[PDB]
Structure 1
Amino acid sequence: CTSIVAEDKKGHLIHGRNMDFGVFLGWNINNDTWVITEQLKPLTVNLDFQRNNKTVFKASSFAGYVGMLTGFKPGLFSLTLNERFSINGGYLGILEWILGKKDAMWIGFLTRTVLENSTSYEEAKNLLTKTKILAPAYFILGGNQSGEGCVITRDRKESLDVYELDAKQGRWYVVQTNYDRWKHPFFLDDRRTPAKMCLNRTSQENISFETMYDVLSTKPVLNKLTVYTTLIDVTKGQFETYLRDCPDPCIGW
């Protein structure tokens, strides 16, 4: 996955993400695709969650999966989740849950609770920062005012770091793939550096839905695992997601 929260010259927030998933079922040697990735594209749906014929939050999810991986509350905040890798991952977290310690929330469910029930960017931020979880994760969260955008690197029981926007110091975007910002990306899978060069070439002035979709279409930020691309605009209420393909030639991950 790749999640970006950018801020144009006039303080407008654009939140874009790519959803990479599907290495686990293997490879389709006949047309050069991942088995799950191709099977998730016809399952991808957009969801207008309503209460009293009024939109609570919108989302992009896979049909039959009740948690939320991409979504926003119109005019409030936007939230995408990126997978984080760890030593044992969810497995301790799952073990503790079976043996009886249920004081922690499942990863898809918490972002589902935050999108459905949180009221502000600060409320969402506080809950994603300090809620116990069963597995590590990246929470990429943008707000409705200027400077309200951050990546929350999460351990199971602790917030390792929160990387926020600072336009005054020249930081107008936050990128996050699947590796800790202070650490280095795995040699064979660096999508964070091309994402930045494309954002840097685009310039803060020109960042928009069109240029944000541009960077998420550049290989390897676009790759065989990319199921969909979502561009969010919390203030304008716009929420578009598009199924993707990466025709040969294209990197696999």
Structure 2
Amino acid sequence: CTSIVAQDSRGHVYHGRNLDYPYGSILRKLTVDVQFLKNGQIAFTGTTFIGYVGLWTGQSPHKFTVSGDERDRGWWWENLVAALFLRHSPISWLLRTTLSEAESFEAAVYRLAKTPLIADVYYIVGGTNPREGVVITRNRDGPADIWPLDPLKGVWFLVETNYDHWKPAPEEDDRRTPAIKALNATGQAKLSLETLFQVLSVVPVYNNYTIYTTVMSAASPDKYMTRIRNPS
């Protein structure tokens, strides 16, 4: 996958992601944007596949945006015990529960960071105010690291793919560098939804496994935009 939370020169937080998964030819036909309602009002918006009740990409309007990237670490039997004996929570279900119950960007990063899971994951969260953007590297028991935005220090964007950000990306699957390089060229001044969408369209960040690309901003919920990709 590839999740990106970034902050522009004026202080807006933008969020975009790529969902890379096999079985593309089938899932591109099932991809949908779902607006979960409450008392008639939109309580949050998500993107999933018909028949999949979890969310890997969502947005609570005027609060936060969250997306998830795969983190393969551990052994097969740790997911079995975590799910059966300990009653942990799936990843795509905790991401949706947070979009529904979390009242603020801080409470959304607390739940996503501390709630026990069945497997590891990277939860990339965005907010409505400046400097609100973290990348939660999760264990099954709790958080393993929290990577925050720091514009004044020269870190105005966080690029998460499928590997720990404090380690060198593998040479075989290094989608981090081209996403960083393309973000360096875009510049913190001209960063917008459309310019972020272009970063997620740069090979190999945009690969044959990309099913859809979402770009969103919690402060401007109506600009939530998902585009199904037909890689070639």
SS in 1 for 2:78: helix
Q: Deviations over 1:42-68 (max 9, x none)?
A: 000000111111110001001111111
Partner of 1:121: 105
Partner of 1:71: 58
Indicate the percent of aligned positions where both proteins have the same amino acid. 40
The normalised TM-score by structure 1 is 0.89
What 5-or-longer segments of structure 1 have no aligned partner?
23-35, 248-253
1 CA distance for matches of 2:130 and 2:46?
23
- Of the three residues 42, 60, 78, the one matched with 1:92 is 78
Q: Partner letter of residue 200 of structure 2?
A: L
Partner of 2:86: 101
Post-superposition shift, 1:105? 1.1
Root mean square deviation of aligned Cα: 1.0
2 CA distance for matches of 1:53 and 1:87?
43
1 CA distance for matches of 2:121 and 2:41?
31
Partner of 1:6: 6
Post-superposition shift, 1:158? 2.6
Post-superposition shift, 1:96? 4.1
What 5-or-longer segments of structure 2 have no aligned partner?
none
After TM superposition, the runs of 4+ consecutive aligned structure 1 residues lying more than 6 A away are none
Partner of 1:240: 225
Partner of 2:28: 41
The number of residues matched between the two structures is 231
2 CA distance for matches of 1:202 and 1:56?
33
Partner of 1:27: none
The normalised TM-score by structure 2 is 0.97
Q: Partner letter of residue 42 of structure 1?
A: K
2:135 paired with 1:151: yes
- Of the three residues 11, 32, 41, the one matched with 1:54 is 41
SS in 1 for 2:111: helix
2 CA distance for matches of 1:41 and 1:93?
28
SS in 2 for 1:213: helix
SS in 2 for 1:123: helix
